[PDB]
Design a protein around this ligand. Sequence first.
Ligand SMILES: [Mg+2]
Ligand SMILES: [Mg+2]
Ligand SMILES: [Mg+2]
Ligand SMILES: [Mg+2]
Ligand SMILES: [Mg+2]
Ligand SMILES: [Mg+2]
Ligand SMILES: [Mg+2]
Ligand SMILES: [Mg+2]
Ligand SMILES: [Mg+2]
Ligand SMILES: [Mg+2]
Ligand SMILES: [Mg+2]
Ligand SMILES: [Mg+2]
Ligand SMILES: [Mg+2]
Ligand SMILES: [Mg+2]
Ligand SMILES: [Mg+2]
Ligand SMILES: [Mg+2]
Ligand SMILES: [Mg+2]
Ligand SMILES: [Mg+2]
Ligand SMILES: [Mg+2]
Ligand SMILES: [Mg+2]
Ligand SMILES: [Mg+2]
Ligand SMILES: [Mg+2]
Ligand SMILES: [Mg+2]
Ligand SMILES: [Mg+2]
Ligand SMILES: [Mg+2]
Ligand SMILES: [Mg+2]
Ligand SMILES: [Mg+2]
Ligand SMILES: [Mg+2]
Ligand SMILES: [Mg+2]
Ligand SMILES: [Mg+2]
Ligand SMILES: [Mg+2]
Ligand SMILES: [Mg+2]
Ligand SMILES: [Mg+2]
Ligand SMILES: [Mg+2]
Ligand SMILES: [Mg+2]
Ligand SMILES: [Mg+2]
Lengths: 204, 87, 79, 66
Amino acid sequence: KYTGSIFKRSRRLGFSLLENNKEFSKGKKRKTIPGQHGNRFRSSTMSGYAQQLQEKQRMQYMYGITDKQFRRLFRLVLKQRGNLAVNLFRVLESRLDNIVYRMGFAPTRRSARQLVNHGHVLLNDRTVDTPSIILNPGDKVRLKAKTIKIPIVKAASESGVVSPFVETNNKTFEGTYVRFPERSELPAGINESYVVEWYKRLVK
Amino acid sequence: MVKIRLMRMGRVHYPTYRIVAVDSRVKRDGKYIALIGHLNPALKENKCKIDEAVALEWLNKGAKPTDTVRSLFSQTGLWKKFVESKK
Amino acid sequence: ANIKSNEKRLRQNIKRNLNNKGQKTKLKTNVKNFHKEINLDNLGNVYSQADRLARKGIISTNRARRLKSRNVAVLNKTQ
Amino acid sequence: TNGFEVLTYIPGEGHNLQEHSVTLLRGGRVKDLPGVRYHIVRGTLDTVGVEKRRQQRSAYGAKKPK
RNA sequence: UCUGAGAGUUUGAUCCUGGCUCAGGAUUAACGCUGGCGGCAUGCCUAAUACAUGCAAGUCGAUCGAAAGUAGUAAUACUUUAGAGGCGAACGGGUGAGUAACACGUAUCCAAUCUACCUUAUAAUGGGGGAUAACUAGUUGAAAGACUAGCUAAUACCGCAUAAGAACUUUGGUUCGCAUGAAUCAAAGUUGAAAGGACCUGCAAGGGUUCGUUAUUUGAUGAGGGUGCGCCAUAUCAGCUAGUUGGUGGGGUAACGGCCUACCAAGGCAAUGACGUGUAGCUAUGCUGAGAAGUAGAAUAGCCACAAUGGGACUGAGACACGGCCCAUACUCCUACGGGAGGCAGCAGUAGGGAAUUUUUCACAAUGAGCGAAAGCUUGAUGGAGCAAUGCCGCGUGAACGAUGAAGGUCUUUAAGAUUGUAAAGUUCUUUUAUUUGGGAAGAAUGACUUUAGCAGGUAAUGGCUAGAGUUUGACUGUACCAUUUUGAAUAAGUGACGACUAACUAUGUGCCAGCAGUCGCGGUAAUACAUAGGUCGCAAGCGUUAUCCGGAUUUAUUGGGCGUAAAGCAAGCGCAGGCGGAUUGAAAAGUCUGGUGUUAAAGGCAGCUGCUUAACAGUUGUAUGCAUUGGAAAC
Ligand SMILES: [Mg+2]
Ligand SMILES: [Mg+2]
Ligand SMILES: [Mg+2]
Ligand SMILES: [Mg+2]
Ligand SMILES: [Mg+2]
Ligand SMILES: [Mg+2]
Ligand SMILES: [Mg+2]
Ligand SMILES: [Mg+2]
Ligand SMILES: [Mg+2]
Ligand SMILES: [Mg+2]
Ligand SMILES: [Mg+2]
Ligand SMILES: [Mg+2]
Ligand SMILES: [Mg+2]
Ligand SMILES: [Mg+2]
Ligand SMILES: [Mg+2]
Ligand SMILES: [Mg+2]
Ligand SMILES: [Mg+2]
Ligand SMILES: [Mg+2]
Ligand SMILES: [Mg+2]
Ligand SMILES: [Mg+2]
Ligand SMILES: [Mg+2]
Ligand SMILES: [Mg+2]
Ligand SMILES: [Mg+2]
Ligand SMILES: [Mg+2]
Ligand SMILES: [Mg+2]
Ligand SMILES: [Mg+2]
Ligand SMILES: [Mg+2]
Ligand SMILES: [Mg+2]
Ligand SMILES: [Mg+2]
Ligand SMILES: [Mg+2]
Ligand SMILES: [Mg+2]
Ligand SMILES: [Mg+2]
Ligand SMILES: [Mg+2]
Ligand SMILES: [Mg+2]
Ligand SMILES: [Mg+2]
Ligand SMILES: [Mg+2]
């Protein structure tokens, strides 16, 4: 369950999946809002609601998340101790298929989600099929063995390009993760904290 | 005629009982008098977290247990304590 | 729409009612005889019948007690 | 079905009402006509739906063109 | 350590008062369009309307006579139950009609009470009698049945002998109390019980275990009563009440009581709201709110009331008894016309009402209930399985590569061009889902019972206790789930909106017509508001519209508003009751503050943790508020 026009959505929001693969393309290098009414005036002065909605949509499309799941996670995180601007970021980044992407065994986040749903991924001491499990740094998320021989495993095992917050112990595909991602590892695609306030208003 | 017996507070396909001192004529999963201790059929080990104090008080008062309750008192050894306190 | 247990209980309680009514009427006539011709002898019979009925449960034991107490009060007042 | 007679606006272009039919009213309020405070659900009972409509048809009771 | 967002709309334009509308949640929801699956949970809100049909409380032969069947030459063995008897049918299940009050919540007093089975402890379980079910025969009938005469049995019933202790009194003592009045004696008088069964041993006599019975004793649970406080609207309801208020004697009730009775009195409540009318089951809680609080009393749990309507009563520890009894009313049905049968607000299900809410199912396998020693039996309680996107949560319609651009559509900045658009075509890959193959649980990680070993009381034997073995038991169930099992992107996307609030615009057609609208308001021949198309935006197995509730609304303002000109100071005065009130001292402690104790059922809320692939969900620990009592503080 996801959109099939990630190019269109990236062109609208202006922010791709941090690689600009859906912006560079092989044609026209288009960086405009889609549709016929893309090259018009009235660019800035987006309302507060408009910019909050745009940022929230970018955040919840960067990971393939349904808004109801977003409300659920926010209601989960909100009650604890206090200012959790360091906790809810870990909460949002701890997705299993997201961790598979930052592991580097799939070309794209939703392709990793498809593999997770199809059951080519294991866990610390169990197996996981649902691509929404909340993880905690310390679990040995070891990859499957019968999926290392599939005709599409090359770019999967080419994980030498990896994020520093996912440690694989290369050539062993152990793929654990410690040293939670910082705002540096969460790039400028969405780096704002009043989406938190928007969900505070629209969710008690 | 209080009767130490079980009471279900689980969900569909997952029972969970509580040993409790309750009257004979009151319905199952209703109002009770004193709580003894919970129990899970699939707790593997220590399936009955027993109290051993107010339970002994109520059997001394004259509570009549059930088959399952007597069994639970038995594996832990509460039946021995009751019989020796009777003697 | 009927139960054999209920029917049997009805058939039993008819006979039980007959016997108990006989006993209660005997008690009534004995206490009436006592009050009619007051005499310390009849108080013993009142005692016996009331106690027997109270044990059998035909009469309420507390009513038997009050009957005994009031008859003894009458006897003590008159003597 | 109760004993109250109400003036109800038929929300559509063209109707099959024949001065004697069974309709299913819902709440609403047309601003132009004073006294009218109900609408007729289209295409649920004896009253036929609104064909020749592809936009916002789910409100007017029109089968999907497919 | 709590903790609160606003905007549109009166005017040529502005400020304020002020009403309307919207942005957010939620439901026992319904409707339109569409629709793939799983985990939890919910599912006649209306006609307490009427019900076809099938099931929903029985059990014990180790209480008793008889009868039947299978074996046996017989004596007899085994099995079964129509009937008597015991226990249970007052639990459990449903509904919310009635009820505005001790109905309910809370705190209490029952010196004014009951309590079967259960717990502890303590004496007995001796001996007789008369009957009737079942059966036999006759009358009456198709049968239900009914009537009459005989025959039996007991743990059915009625006497008698006997009271360790009981109940009611007498005599004086004790300790007293809260006014009636309770508590304990020492002696005496009167009254008062029952039943045996199973098994073992013993030649017998006798002895023994166990179940059960009578009379008591201790608690505990359960039931009942009284009182203080809290608990709807309405004065466009001002008087209501004659068993109503009080006293004396008696009766009745488990108990006090005008509860009832006969006599004597005239009192009782009421403006601090009687009474009348309307409405409603109450509460823990659900939803909402920053809070004070608003609103509904889904599911479930506590209590109350009801069982077609209205009365009465038997049995019983307990009923004035949903599927017990008697009578009347209304209705339906059967008849061979004399007579009868009936109560789904129990589980499914039918008709009807409605916008609308499901199988005419399986199993007692676990939990619980009743009977029983067990075998077991019964359990529409209960556990499952069907149906339904009804709600929350979860997963899918694919993945990589792929034209500075396939076709088609829409705009053409009248060749060029954009846009849909890596979207597509095409090359490879996977199978949550789908279709075959193999394996396959969790709950029954319990259990009752029976042969064993050991301890254990008494011992001369049997029962109870622990360990092992066995029968071991599944509706779900060949189900959840698992595996390199064959095939294959194959089996899966809709709905609303785009002038502003509010993220998102062009063309065609119509031309104050057809139509839209939550508000401002669009449409009079150049419509981004109508209808269609394209494009785009918000959500997504759901999306919109409708209804209701809360918030925003400081818009009934205690927290938290006002009355010169915007709604609002009575025309003015004399003023009872009420509210408020100068300064100082003393006492008490009704308000106020604080310590201890009891309680405020469980579930629900918040915090922590565990288990379901994480969640929803389940479980577990902690977590307040008020009332009462007792002990202090003395500023107001
Ligand atoms: Mg104007
Ligand atoms: Mg109803
Ligand atoms: Mg029988
Ligand atoms: Mg009942
Ligand atoms: Mg129920
Ligand atoms: Mg009502
Ligand atoms: Mg009894
Ligand atoms: Mg005899
Ligand atoms: Mg007898
Ligand atoms: Mg005698
Ligand atoms: Mg508020
Ligand atoms: Mg309820
Ligand atoms: Mg209801
Ligand atoms: Mg009826
Ligand atoms: Mg009786
Ligand atoms: Mg019935
Ligand atoms: Mg009954
Ligand atoms: Mg039914
Ligand atoms: Mg069962
Ligand atoms: Mg659903
Ligand atoms: Mg979902
Ligand atoms: Mg073209
Ligand atoms: Mg693609
Ligand atoms: Mg098993
Ligand atoms: Mg429209
Ligand atoms: Mg339009
Ligand atoms: Mg308000
Ligand atoms: Mg309002
Ligand atoms: Mg004002
Ligand atoms: Mg004025
Ligand atoms: Mg004036
Ligand atoms: Mg004036
Ligand atoms: Mg004056
Ligand atoms: Mg005054
Ligand atoms: Mg509680
Ligand atoms: Mg919970």
